[PDB]
Amino acid sequence: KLASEKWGTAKPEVKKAMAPLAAGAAWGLEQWDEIAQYTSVMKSQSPDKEFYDAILCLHRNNFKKAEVHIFNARDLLVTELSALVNESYNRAYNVVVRAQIIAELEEIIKYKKLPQNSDKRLTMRETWNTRLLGCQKNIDVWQRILRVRSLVIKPKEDAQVRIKFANLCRKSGRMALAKKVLNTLLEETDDPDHPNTAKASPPVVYAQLKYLWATGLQDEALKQLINFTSRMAHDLVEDYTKLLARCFLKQGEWRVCLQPKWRLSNPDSILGSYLLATH
C-alpha cells in the first residue's frame, strides 16, 4: 500500500530509503514481480541489486539473467569481510555469513534447473535441505529461506522443515508464531478446520494446538486432545510418530489444565487420562 507512498517519497537518495521494505517486498510481498520496476526505483548499481538480478533466471529459463552473478557474487563478498574474517568471532558468523550464503547457493535452485527428474534429486535436495541444517539451527531461517525455499514449491514441498521453523517462530516472539500461522495454519493446502481434509497433519494441528496456549484456549484443546482420545486414538506411515507429539499431550496439554489441581486427591482420575501421559 506504501508502493505509491514508497515512490511518492522518491527522488536518488530516498531510493536508498526504499531499501531494507522492498529489497524482504521486491521477493517479500509472495511475488517477485514490485523486482520489475524495483531493481532498476532504487540499485543496476549494488552487491545487494546484483545478486537480485540473478533471480529472474529462476522465476524464467535464461540462465544469464544467474550467470557474471556467480563470479559478481564470488568476488560483491572474498572481499567484504578479507580482514578479521573467525567462527566464534561474533561479527562473522551472522551477516557477512549470510552474504556468503548468497555465493554457494548459485549452483545449489540451479539443480531443481539442472538435474531432472526421477534420481537422488529429492533425497539430494532432503540432503541440500539435512546437510543445510549444518552450521547449527536458528533465527533468520526465514532473509534466507524467505527467498531460498522458493526452490520450486513452498509447507507442501519438506510443513516439517517448517513448522519446526514455526516452532522457531512458536518459540520466538508471536512477530517472528502468528503471522506465520496466519498462512501456515493455511497449511498451504487445507471448514473451521474440518474434524477430518488439517487428519492431514496432527504435527499442523500441534502447530495449532501448542498455539491454541498462545490463543488462553485450554477448553478447545483439551476438545482437540479429546478429538485426538476418542476419534486419532481410534484412527486404533505420520501412524508411528502419532505415540511420540500423543501421550505427550496427556502431559505437554494436560499440564496447565492440572494447574488448580496438582496435589493429593485434586490428579485422581487425571491419574490416567497420567497413566498412558507416561507408563
Place this chain on the structure above:
Amino acid sequence: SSLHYASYHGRYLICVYLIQLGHDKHELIKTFKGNTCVHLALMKGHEQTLHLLLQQFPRFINHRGENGRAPIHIACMNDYYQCLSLLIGVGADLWVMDTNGDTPLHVCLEYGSISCMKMLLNEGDNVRDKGNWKPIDVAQTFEVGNIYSKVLKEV
C-alpha cells in the same frame, strides 16, 4: 518435452492432455529463445491451439524472450491464425516493439506486407526504429510500397 512438444502438434486434446500433467502455462520451459506458450503454438502458427491456450493460459505482463519481440513479432513470424482478433481479445499492450525500440510495423514494413497494413490498419509515421526511422521514412527504407502507399493511405 515429457511438455513443450505438442506446441510444435498444435494438439490443442494433446495440450487437454499434458491438463492432467497443470507443467506451467506460458511452456514451464519458457524454450532460451523465449518460445513461451504462444511464443513457441504463434511462432508455429497454431489459432486452434495462440483458443484453448487464451482459455488452459490467460497469464500476467508476459516477454522479451531474449528476442526483444513479446510474441505479439513471433506471431507475424508464422502469421498466427486470428492473432489480429486474439491480441485484441487479450490487451496486446499494443507497444510492444522489436529490438530497435520501432514497433513491429516499422518489422513488417522494412516486410511491406500489404499482410501483416491490411489486420494492421484494422488495429489503428506516428512507429520509430533505433535512430528514429518512421514506419512512412524503415518503408521508403526498403522501398516497401504495398505498405507505404496501404502508411498515402494513413497519412
Place this chain on the structure above:
Amino acid sequence: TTFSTLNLIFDKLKSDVPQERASGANELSTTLTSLAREVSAEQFQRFSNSLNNKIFELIHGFTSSEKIGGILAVDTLISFYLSTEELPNQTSRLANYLRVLIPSSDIEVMRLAANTLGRLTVPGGTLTSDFVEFEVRTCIDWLTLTADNNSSSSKLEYRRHAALLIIKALADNSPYLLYPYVNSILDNIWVPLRDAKLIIRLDAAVALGKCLTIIQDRDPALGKQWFQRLFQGCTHGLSLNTNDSVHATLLVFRELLSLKAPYLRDKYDDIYKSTMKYKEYKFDVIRREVYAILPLLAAFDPAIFTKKYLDRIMVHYLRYLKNIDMNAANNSDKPFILVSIGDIAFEVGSSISPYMTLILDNIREGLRTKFKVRKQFEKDLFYCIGKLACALGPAFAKHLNKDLLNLMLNCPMSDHMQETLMILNEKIPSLESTVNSRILNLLSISLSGEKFIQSNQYDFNNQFSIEKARKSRNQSFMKKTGESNDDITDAQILIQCFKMLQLIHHQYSLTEFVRLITISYIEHEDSSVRKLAALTSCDLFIKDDICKQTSVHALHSVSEVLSKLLMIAITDPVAEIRLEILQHLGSNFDPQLAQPDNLRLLFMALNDEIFGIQLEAIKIIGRLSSVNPAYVVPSLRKTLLELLTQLKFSNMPKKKEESATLLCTLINSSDEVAKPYIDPILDVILPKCQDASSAVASTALKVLG
C-alpha cells in the same frame, strides 16, 4: 636426446630461409625443458642464448633467420623463460642485441632493436641501460656512422620505434617519463629528415603527440612543442621541397595535430590553407598524405567544407590517373578517397550531397571497366568509403549495388564477398544478401534433381588455374550462415561438391559443410535418401587421417555433431563400435587419443558393453597410475584425458576396481604438480556414488589436511 643437436638445427643458417626450422626443431626445444628462467641448469636453451646467439651478433642471416631465431632466442627468454627482467635479459639482450647494432643487416632494427622494443622489462635502469645507451647509438644514429653501417638508418629511425615501445609502453608504465619531450624534437624531427627512413622518423614523433599526452601535458608541453608543430610546419618556408626531402615531415605534425596538441582548431586555418597547396601544388605520393592526415581528425564541423572541397577540387581536376607515381599505374583504390574515407568516416548517409559519393560512382562503373586490364578487380577503398551509407531508402542505395554485383564476378576475382558482408547486415531490406548468395559462382545454382558431377563448369574471361578458382570460388560457399538453401540442390549439389571439394584436398571448403550442415540441417527428420548417408558422410572421418593435422579439423567435427549424435547412431551401431575403436585407435593430434570427444563418447548410453569396452580401458591405466615409472612422456596426461573422461563417464564404481583405483589416485596425491589432484575430484563427481565416502571421511580429511 641432448634440445641441442634441436637448438643447433634456428645457433647458426643451417639454408636460404630458416625461421621455419626455428619455430618447429625455439618451439620444439623450449616447450620440452617445460622450464622457465628457473631450469643456470638451462646452461645446457641457453648457452647453445649466449654462444644461440652470437653465431643472431655475427651472421644475423642475410634473410633474418638468425633474427626471427633472434627475436622464436631471447621470445623464449622474455616470457616463456619466466626472473628474467634484470639479471640475464638486461645483461644478454644488451649483450646480443646491442653489441648484433652500431650495424644492422636486413632490418635488425625491427628484429633485435625492435624485439629492444617489446621486452617491457624497469623503465629507468631501459629513461641508463638499453634511454642513456639508446641516446648514443638514436643520437650518433639520427645522422650513419660507418658508410655495412650505411643499416644504422635503418637502426635510427625502428630503434629511435622501438627506448619511442619502451617512450611508450615503459617510459605508459610511467606516463610522465621526461624523453626530453620538447627539446630534442626541434632532432629527431632535423638531423632522418633528409631522405633516409623518411617514413620511420615519424613513428618516434608519432610516439614522442601520443607519448607526450599519455607525459594530458597537452597545453604547456605540446605548446613548447608547437614550433619545432607550427620547424616541421614551417619546414616547407624554413629547407623549399627539393632540398631536405620534405614529404614525411610536412606526416607527423600532418598526423600528433589531428590527435592532440592544442593546435588543430588553430591550424585549419594555418597549415591546411600550408598543404591544400602542397597536395595540389608537386603532386607527391608523401604531400596525398601531408594532406590525407590533417583533415581526417580536423573532422568536427568547424574544420568549413574550403576540408571537403579540395579533396574534391584533387578528385576532379588532377586526373583520376593520379594514383601519380605516373599518369596509367594499376587501376586501384584511387589515392582522394585515400585521404576522404576517415574524413564522409564520420557523417550519416541521407544528410554532403549524395552527389559527393556519385562523382565517385562514375569513376566506379568507370573503375568497374578500369581494372579490366589490371588486377581483373580492385574496387578496397570503395567498400572504406562505403561505410560512410546504407541513404535515400533504396532510391539510389536499389542501384548503388546491380552494378557492384557485376564487379566481383566476371574475370578471376573474390576476396570483396571479405570486406561487400558487413553492409549486407546493416540493411533493413535484406533484398541482395539473400541475390549474391543464387550466383554461388560456378555451375552450382538452385533448382535441382539430376546432373549436379561436373564442377568443371569453369567461367573463362581470364580463362584459370582452378586453385586461386579453388579457395576464389569457396571463399561464396565460406562466408555463409546456414540461411536457407535445399538439401537435393547446400547438404546434394554439395554432398556432390563437399566430398571431393574438401579431397582433393584439405578440409578450403569442408570448414563450411559439417559446420553449415548441422547449422543448416538435422532436423532433417524420414530421408532414407540421409540416414545411412549421413552415416556415407560421417563413415570421410574414419580416415580424417588424410592429413594427421586436419584430423584436428575430426577433432574440432569432434568438438563440433555433438548435438545432429544419437538419432544418427541407433541405426549405426556396429559402424560405432567401429567409429567408437576409432576414440578407443585415435584422435591421433592432445598428447595421444581419447580426449576431444571425451564427453561426446559417453552419450551413447542405452546401448552396449560403451559400460565395458570403457571398463577394461579404465584398469588395460591403475597399472600404467603413472607416476606404476613405467609414463615416460605423455601416459600421465592419457592418466589423468583418462580419468578426465571418467568425470564425464558419469556411472559405475567395478566397488571392490572404484576403491582400488582410488587406492592409487592416494599414493598419487604425492609428488609432481597441479596432475594427481585433477585425477580425485575426477572420480568424486561420481562422491564415493554410495551416502558417504565409506572410510575415503578421513583418508579425505589427512589429504585435506
